[PDB]
Design a protein around this ligand. Sequence first.
Ligand SMILES: Nc1ncnc2c1ncn2[C@@H]1O[C@H](COP(=O)(O)OP(=O)(O)NP(=O)(O)O)[C@@H](O)[C@H]1O
Length: 450
Amino acid sequence: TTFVALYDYESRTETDLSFKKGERLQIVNNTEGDWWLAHSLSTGQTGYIPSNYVAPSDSIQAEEWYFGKITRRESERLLLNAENPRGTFLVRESETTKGAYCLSVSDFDNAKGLNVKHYKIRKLDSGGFYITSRTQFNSLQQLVAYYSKHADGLCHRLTTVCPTSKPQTQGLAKDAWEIPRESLRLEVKLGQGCFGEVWMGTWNGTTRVAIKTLKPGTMSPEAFLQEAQVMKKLRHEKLVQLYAVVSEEPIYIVTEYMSKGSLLDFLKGETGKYLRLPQLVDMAAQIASGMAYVERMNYVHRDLRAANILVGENLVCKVADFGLARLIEDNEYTARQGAKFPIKWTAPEAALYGRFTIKSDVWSFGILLTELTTKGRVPYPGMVNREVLDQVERGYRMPCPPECPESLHDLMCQCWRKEPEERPTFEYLQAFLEDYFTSTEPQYQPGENL
Ligand SMILES: Nc1ncnc2c1ncn2[C@@H]1O[C@H](COP(=O)(O)OP(=O)(O)NP(=O)(O)O)[C@@H](O)[C@H]1O
């Protein structure tokens, strides 16, 4: 009946419990959802813990190398990390065959360099588990134990478990949402937007967070609180999580801190000097993935651009600042006008008639695509804000960027169709970009290569 910690966790409050990976814990109350009351069997300490940091003892989820429901693409990003020795692996659920699993392994070819090999694990009618029919096992852990000693047909002996980063807890702590202004300490100014500032800081003197401040008069706290309730329910690995808020003016917005900064700045400079097409297309794919979730949830971003995409380790990109723009009470901004309104990323029907939809976000994604292929160069280079809308209304569209493949420029043009409903979906954009360089995420090795 005991559980086991999958990761190390540091206590953030007076009532939660710290633990180290591998510690055995007794859930002495699970009547909650994301935060459970636990008791450490080794230390005797009690306290709340994030439910996504533990797994039932002896379960397959308890296995260090079992990544469960991770896609083939996501598993590849993790395995291809430069630090990973050859033979680094993970096991996950197969996407094409229900009930089946998959062993993904990192390999190096002197005529292909670093690469990932995928092997589908089928479970017979009897009960055996196998990659090759000439070798079956009664369990996934038995299989893994075998190939850790002998490659036996695999690209390399299983050597190291794929490392990963601690998952985000849902909320800063149990029941924390509308928090006291004094629970935060601002430490490093990260930037100054148009309606406030952003700082790297600390919550409760223990947790690293990002804090955005809104100048009084920007938007009504009441409307803000209603909208924050909606955004709070949006959870996806390619969306920056909203942690907590201080609803009274000056309004505070606490989200997860992205150390690598914005995509725009990462695009310009030295960080993006040797950035090649395959990298830029993968970042675009991640962005389309988060926006497809937004699409599935029937939500609307309203301010999509490279400045609003954040970067993390493993070239991870996350969609930020969604929903807020709609609350701005600024008179000029409300009329899609002013030096504060991002007209260069706005679809004509949104600017002209205020018709903001997932389709106008698709138009914005097309513009973002140009920043990604021009090292962050500003859209419509020779045009001033005040003349952009009239030009685009008459049919003007940016030409193919220098060095950008025409095929990608064609995608942008689809996103910029005059008819919003003729514009592609984010589901489509994600699939197109993920499979851009011949790779619809298929192909599994056969079995015995020698
Ligand atoms: N969660 C975060 N983690 C790290 N840095 C962040 C984070 N959020 C914002 N920033 C940084 O802060 C600046 C953004 O401030 P912000 O007020 O959001 O301006 P913006 O980029 O101009 N767009 P907008 O907010 O739509 O007007 C950029 O330097 C970002 O890198």
